[PDB]
């Protein structure tokens, strides 16, 4: 039942050419996204770490 509203187009008059780019969040999941600049893969990066995770990120960057 997740396939109901997926089958659609852009209904506007003037619009650029879009591409089915696969995006990943801070996890293993992928989502199909109409996005320009026809790269096949797009990734989202880790932000700000945490108070006890900034030191772990610094240690991972050092190692």
């Amino acid at each position: 039942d997740c396939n109901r509203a997926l089958l659609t187009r852009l209904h506007r008059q003037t619009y650029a050419r879009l591409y089915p780019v696969l995006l990943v969040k801070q996890d293993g999941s992928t989502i199909h996204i109409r996005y320009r600049e026809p790269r096949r893969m797009l990734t989202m990066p880790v932000d700000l770490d945490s108070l006890s995770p900034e030191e772990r990120r610094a240690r991972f960057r050092k190692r």
């Binding site: 109901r4 008059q13 003037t14 696969l22 293993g28 989502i31």
Partner: protein
């Protein structure tokens, strides 16, 4: 002194009586750069085989959509009939129970849910580091 507070309260009243006009929506407005990228876009002569395949596929899609809407409406009707005979059964069971169960709970107020994705989340995966800078115009 007090005259400063008088002209101040005059200012809050005067800029309060102005309009609360909305932000424009970017998506409803065609951008300016989209004008001159049309001269090298030629029309495509659509062949008859492609046109008839598109048309018959549209007829099959319309029939399938009508049938799928019909079974979704049948499912919601079955759920509603079950819930009708259900509330009748509980009302015949106990008065205090339908006094309690006709509520919408305050825990429903932050109802948030995320749609399913293409691939499942994998374990032991480390995406790289980065930052986000908000360029949304205010």
């Amino acid at each position: 002194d007090q005259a400063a507070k008088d002209r101040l309260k005059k200012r809050i009243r005067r800029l309060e009586k102005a309009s609360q006009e909305l932000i424009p929506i970017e998506d409803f407005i065609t951008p300016v750069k989209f004008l001159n990228k049309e001269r090298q876009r030629p029309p495509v002569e659509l062949p008859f085989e492609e046109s008839e395949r598109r048309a018959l596929l549209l007829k099959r899609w319309s029939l399938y959509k009508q049938r799928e809407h019909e079974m979704e409406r049948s499912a919601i009707r079955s759920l509603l009939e079950a819930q009708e005979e259900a509330l009748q059964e509980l009302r015949l069971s106990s008065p205090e129970l339908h006094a309690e169960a006709t509520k919408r709970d305050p825990s429903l107020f932050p109802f948030e849910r995320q749609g399913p994705d293409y691939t499942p989340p994998i374990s032991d995966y480390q995406p790289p580091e980065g930052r986000y800078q908000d360029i949304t115009k205010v």
